[PDB]
């Protein structure tokens, strides 16, 4: 177009904000991030992307970010914008806790962050946040939830969605292999492993290319833990065994 | 040809060393209607050629009150004109509130000069495209001051600004000595003759299109319109 895409506030003749679309393209450039909702709990399986041997992982979550005791999120986009957005998410959640002395519902936090992003997209002179976030959380109103945010400022509640690289293929695969109402945490992990294995065509998963975090409720407490490398290796081995068995059966 | 880049903005200096936005403001004030302002040894008279948008529409006023001893003649942009008139009225009120004396005309003109200079130096602001002929009476006597869209101001014994004002200026320059020493009625008739010189030969001055503002020694600034300017028109010589 070479116009209507400079100030982040010009409407195209057809009514398009091309800067938001370019931000979404930047999201597409990011690594694969996947989240599946199940009755037992909701999980996030994200590609670690950076795999340089000399790189060190001093944090427990390379790209997973715990927002509060009842919530967690994953990132696919610009890293620094993601950091500031996660800080703002934590700030908003703690402000709600201070005001009402109760954990913030997931939808409220997602709406607040999306309002911030939409405000950034509305006023000229500010670069839109090129980050797409996937939220997993539990609340007393709707239980387990999975949400997806966009640079534009639009969110949505999904049962199984993926953002980042090869998002369309992952979404189609989830549509093919998701059983609404009968999906359990273990089957959810298996499906996530299968989707990650297909989407990332570099090679078979080695548990260092991916990062899986599961959200569950134990003894009336929300437990957010990141699966250890050994557990991811076992899941990958199980998926490989299933694939080999299916291939042998096909003959 | 090569001045397009330096023509758009007022903060951009042209290679020749001339800001074209100020010249365009001068053109804008030139595009307005014609006014004539002259002063005798005891009176200052402003005669203006009011213009009507249509036959049904009333003639738009061009002589505006400022103080008991100061008045202006309108030429150019009307909105900037009203802003300037409000500013001068506020300045005169402040002077009469603080020092309890009429504000000297020269000080008011200097204040207007500074105020209209401020926009020409800053970005995002345009020069005030209005020219004013200011008639007033002070301890020094009658005064006629010409304010240009460029902040610089002029002190004149007689001056005409607006469209087709060159003929009026020529007539005024022809009879300056008579202007200095003459009766109030003679001065008003001279101003009317200059305004007529501005008008085409076929056209003639009428009570509807003539507005007169007079300030003198014992006379405050009074604006005459229609039946009030009829006495001055009566007795005027044929062109």
């Amino acid at each position: 177009s070479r116009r209507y895409d400079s100030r982040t506030t010009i409407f195209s003749p057809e009514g398009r904000l091309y800067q938001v679309e370019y931000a979404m393209e930047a999201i597409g450039h990011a690594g694969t991030c996947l989240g599946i909702l199940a009755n037992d709990g909701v999980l996030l399986a994200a590609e670690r992307r950076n795999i340089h041997k000399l790189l060190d992982e001093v944090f427990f979550s390379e790209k997973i970010y715990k927002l509060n005791e009842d919530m967690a999120c994953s990132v696919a986009g610009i890293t620094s914008d993601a950091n500031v957005l996660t800080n703002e998410l934590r700030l908003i959640a703690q402000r709600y806790l201070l005001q009402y002395q109760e954990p913030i519902p997931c939808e409220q936090l997602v709406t607040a962050l999306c309002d911030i992003k939409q405000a950034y997209t509305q006023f000229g002179g500010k670069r839109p946040f090129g980050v797409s976030l996937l939220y997993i959380g539990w609340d007393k109103h709707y239980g387990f939830q999975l949400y997806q945010s966009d640079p534009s400022g639009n969110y949505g509640g999904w049962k199984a969605t993926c953002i980042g690289n090869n998002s369309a293929a992952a979404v189609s695969m989830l549509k093919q292999d998701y059983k609404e109402g009968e999906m359990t945490l273990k089957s959810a992990l298996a499906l996530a492993i299968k989707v990650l294995n297909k989407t990332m065509d570099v090679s078979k998963l080695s548990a260092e290319k991916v990062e899986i975090a599961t959200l569950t409720r134990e003894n009336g407490k929300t437990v957010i833990r990141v699966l250890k490398q050994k557990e991811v290796e076992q899941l990958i081995k199980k998926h490989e065994e299933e694939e080999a068995k299916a291939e042998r059966e096909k003959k | 040809m090569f001045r397009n880049q330096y023509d758009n903005d007022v903060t951009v200096w042209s290679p020749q060393g001339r800001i074209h936005q100020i010249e365009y403001a001068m053109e804008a004030v030139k595009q307005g209607s014609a006014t004539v302002g002259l002063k005798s040894k005891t009176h200052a008279v402003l005669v203006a050629l009011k213009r009507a948008q249509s036959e049904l529409a009333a003639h738009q006023k061009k002589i505006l009150h400022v103080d008991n001893h100061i008045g202006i003649s309108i030429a150019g942009l009307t909105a900037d004109a009203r802003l300037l008139c409000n500013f001068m009225r506020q300045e005169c009120l402040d002077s009469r509130f603080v020092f309890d004396r009429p504000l000297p005309v020269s000080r008011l003109v200097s204040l207007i000069g500074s105020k209209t200079q401020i926009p020409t130096q800053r970005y995002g602001r345009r020069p005030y495209g209005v020219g004013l002929l200011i008639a007033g009476y002070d301890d020094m006597g009658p005064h006629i001051f010409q304010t240009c869209p460029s902040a610089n101001y002029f002190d004149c014994r007689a001056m005409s600004i607006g469209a087709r004002s060159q003929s009026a200026r020529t007539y005024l320059e022809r009879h300056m000595s008579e202007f200095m020493e003459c009766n109030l009625n003679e001065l008003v008739k001279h101003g009317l003759r200059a305004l007529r010189e501005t008008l085409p030969a076929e056209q003639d001055l009428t009570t509807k299109n003539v507005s007169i503002g007079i300030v003198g020694k014992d006379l405050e600034f009074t604006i005459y319109d229609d039946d009030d300017v009829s006495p001055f028109l009566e007795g005027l010589e044929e062109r």
Binding site: D5, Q19, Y22, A26, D56, E57, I78, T79, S80, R127 | -
Partner: protein, 234 residues
């Protein structure tokens, strides 16, 4: 795809979704003096080269390797004045953290704050991103730390890395050389060798600047110590 208008502006996203000005700032970083940081088990070393144009340069006037606090130091590749401003900001942030919590600021938190400053400077339209990347070192909880803050504000924890000119070759050399349980006073040698790879000429005590951090704290090596290390490695 010239995309010239997209490249001129910072806030303007490219059609592909790339912030071109950030890539230009990264290129500015890559055009700076080489700097090498190695995180050994005993400690972490920050070695860089201070290319002095002429011998009439007071070595004590300026320092590429500067301390932030009693246990955190950093080195840079790119623009000097930006590095100095960022050093002042990092020192202020560390002192604010100490005042608030009465505890030495962990290296990770300081890196996050500096990255937040970088992000703030690259977000709003009207300024340019800091054309400098900081290799920040520290020692917290009996553990060495090495971080690299990019102009965009993305910070990564490294075990060994190099920036500036010939940084890809330096990283390859570190990959060949760096060892898991390597200790200090040997990672210094590895960094010196990496600089040799990235240096054009002979390296003297004044041509390079080395700063180490260990349990005791961050300390910029004196020219005499650099000379003895250079003699030992050659």
């Amino acid at each position: 795809m010239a995309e010239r208008g997209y490249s001129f502006s910072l806030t303007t996203f490219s059609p592909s979704g790339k912030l071109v000005q950030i890539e230009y700032a990264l290129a500015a970083v890559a055009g700076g003096a080489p700097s090498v940081g190695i995180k050994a088990a005993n400690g972490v070393v920050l070695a860089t080269e201070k290319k002095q144009k002429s011998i009439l340069y007071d070595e004590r006037s300026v320092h590429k390797v500067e301390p932030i606090t009693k246990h955190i130091g950093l080195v840079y590749s790119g623009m000097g004045p930006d590095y100095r401003v960022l050093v002042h900001r990092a020192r202020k942030l560390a002192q604010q953290y100490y005042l608030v919590y009465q505890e030495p600021i962990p290296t990770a938190q300081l890196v996050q704050r500096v990255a937040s400053v970088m992000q703030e400077y690259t977000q709003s339209g009207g300024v340019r991103p800091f054309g400098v990347s900081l290799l920040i070192c520290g020692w917290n909880e009996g553990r060495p730390y090495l971080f690299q803050s990019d102009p965009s504000g993305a910070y990564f924890a490294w075990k060994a890395t190099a920036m500036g000119k010939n940084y890809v070759n330096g990283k390859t050399f570190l990959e060949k050389r760096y060892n898991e349980d390597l200790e200090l006073e040997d990672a210094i040698h590895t960094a010196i060798l990496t600089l040799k790879e990235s240096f054009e000429g002979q390296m003297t005590e004044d041509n390079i600047e080395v700063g180490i951090c260990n349990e005791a704290g961050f300390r910029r090596l004196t020219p005499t110590e650099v000379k003895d290390y250079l003699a030992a490695i050659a």
